[PDB]
Amino acid sequence: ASNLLQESNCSQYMEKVLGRLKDEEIRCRKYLHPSSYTKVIHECQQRMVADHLQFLHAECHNIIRQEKKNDMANMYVLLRAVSTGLPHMIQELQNHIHDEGLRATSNLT
Numbered sequence: 660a661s662n663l664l665q666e667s668n669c670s671q672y673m674e675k676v677l678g679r680l681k682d683e684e685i686r687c688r689k690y691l692h693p694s695s696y697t698k699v700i701h702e703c704q705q706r707m708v709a710d711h712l713q714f715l716h717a718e719c720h721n722i723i724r725q726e727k728k729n730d731m732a733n734m735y736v737l738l739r740a741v742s743t744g745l746p747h748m749i750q751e752l753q754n755h756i757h758d759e760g761l762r763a764t765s766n767l768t
Contacts, residue, residue: 660707669718673733676707709741716747723751 663672683703687696715734722730738744
């Protein structure tokens with residue numbers, strides 16, 4: 660994860676992490692007892708998404724403000740697995756909407 664944030668932009672990071680989580684689920688079923696599947700996927704979500712949240716959050720502004728629908732959907736799916744992931748995306752979307760709304764309403768005669 661640490662390597663993935665520095666080498667990949669937020670769009671790519673998200674696509675790779677979604678792939679890795681799936682690889683991990685497959686890996687868990689190939690080797691482990693079912694009692695371990697959830698604990699392992701969670702450990703992966705913690706280390707790949709939660710420990711690297713600040714990077715996702717920095718690019719979240721740009722991703723929202725540019726309305727990149729796929730990246731936003733991918734960002735939403737990853738950030739929804741982390742309890743502290745959605746609040747910043749929510750605030751950034753709120754700010755994007757607020758600024759777009761003030762601009763649309765203040766210039767009225």
